[PDB]
Amino acid sequence: LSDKLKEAETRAEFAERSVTKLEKSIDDLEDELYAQKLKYKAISEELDHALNDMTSI
């Protein structure tokens, strides 16, 4: 059980270390996502507005 435990703890800790990395990947991913959305939003909107106001040329 000790070896199974060390293996289960290895799996739990492996996975905990890995999930921590994945959680970090999510935090980074969401920040990247926000950057994609925010930049997209900013670009699509800065153009809708730039073209809606800048219509006379």
Partner: protein, 375 residues
């Protein structure tokens, strides 16, 4: 037995007491907040036998003792019994005399004034502590977690206080004090285990159910689906071994208990749950504060160790929160020991030495002084 005049850290709650020396990373003396007394007539003579037993003594001889807790829902109701817990914790287990060790105690932000002043009085008049401080558990939780900002959910045995801090400052108008805690979850389990044919009412029985809860219960991420299978099959049952060799097998009660955190009506409480209170602690803060508190939802104290709770909470707050916004839970393995760790960090901080009330200021002002000097 310590090599420095370092303040002790003693997180004394309605459940357990975590005590140790400031500057370290863990408590050294951990006892239940229990004072036990015999409820039987003696027959043999020359048997020793104490008038009262404390901490581990109270549990080791509990077969014939009635066990009481001096602390209830965040406050000391029996300070004489706390002197007994403290004397043992300090002199027998930590092996330190408070006379040379100032000692940091803990409290919730909206905790009654009487408790903070009574704790101050006992340490100065019974233990002759050279100085005192009573700390906010939320402060200590944020130090331990490496933060100055966040919502501290201190969800222990007594009270869930739901208290926000931003840039190290309290935001007291947004504290959502909640009358739902680990002690109620234990009582709920005793009632639904009665439904299964295993009534638990006496001290031995009360201690067993608390142990069952700590070992078997969880929240998971979806109550109704978990209940649909737990109520239909033995595949979600777990057996618990009772002290006499008998066993109890528990099904959906395993999750129905802690679900009270999300469904307080289970114990007759008028509340929407801990995620609503977490949400309001964030929402009731200014709009330019909210973003930092959403990203720093901090788990602290007991019940934070129910499987699925850190993610269950992030999901439940996200469900109430505006879209786009990132809701994040801070839930390190140092969960529940974080108040003790913060106590160590704060007590030993050079920037906080002037925050200790000395036994000069104490006698000139009396114990009410803690209310003006600690924060």
């Amino acid at each position: 037995d310590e090599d420095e005049t370092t303040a002790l850290v003693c997180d004394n709650g309605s459940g357990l007491v975590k005590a140790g020396f400031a500057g370290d990373d863990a408590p050294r003396a951990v006892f239940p907040s229990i004072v036990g007394r015999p409820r039987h007539q003696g027959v043999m003579v020359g048997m020793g036998q104490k008038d009262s037993y404390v901490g581990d003594e109270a549990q080791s001889k509990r077969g014939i003792l009635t066990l009481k807790y001096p602390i209830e829902h965040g406050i000391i109701t029996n300070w004489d019994d706390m002197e007994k817990i403290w004397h043992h914790t300090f002199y027998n287990e930590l092996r330190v005399a408070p006379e040379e060790h100032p000692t940091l105690l803990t409290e919730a932000p909206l905790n009654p004034k009487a408790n903070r002043e009574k704790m101050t009085q006992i340490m100065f008049e019974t233990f002759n502590v050279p100085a005192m401080y009573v700390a906010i558990q939320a402060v200590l939780s944020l130090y331990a977690s490496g933060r100055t900002t966040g919502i501290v959910l201190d969800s222990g045995d007594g009270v869930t206080h739901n208290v926000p801090i931003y840039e190290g400052y309290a935001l007291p108008h947004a504290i959502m004090r909640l009358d739902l805690a680990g002690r109620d979850l234990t009582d709920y389990l005793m009632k639904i285990l009665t439904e299964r044919g295993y009534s638990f009412v006496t001290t031995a029985e009360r201690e067993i159910v608390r142990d069952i809860k700590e070992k078997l219960c969880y929240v998971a991420l979806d109550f109704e689906n978990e209940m649909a299978t737990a109520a239909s099959s033995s595949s979600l049952e777990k057996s618990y071994e009772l002290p006499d060799g008998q066993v109890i097998t528990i099904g959906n009660e395993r999750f129905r208990c802690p679900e009270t955190l999300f469904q307080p009506s289970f114990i007759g409480m008028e509340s929407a749950g801990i995620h609503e209170t977490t949400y309001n602690s964030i929402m009731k803060c200014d709009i330019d504060i909210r973003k930092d508190l959403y990203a720093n939802n901090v788990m602290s104290g007991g019940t934070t160790m129910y499987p699925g709770i850190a993610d269950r909470m992030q999901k439940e707050i996200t469900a109430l929160a505006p879209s786009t916004m990132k809701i994040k839970i801070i839930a390190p393995p140092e969960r529940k020991y974080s108040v003790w760790i913060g106590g160590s960090i704060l007590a030993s901080l050079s920037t906080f030495q002037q925050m200790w009330i000395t036994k000069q200021e104490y006698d000139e002002a009396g114990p009410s002084i803690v209310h003006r000097k600690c924060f």
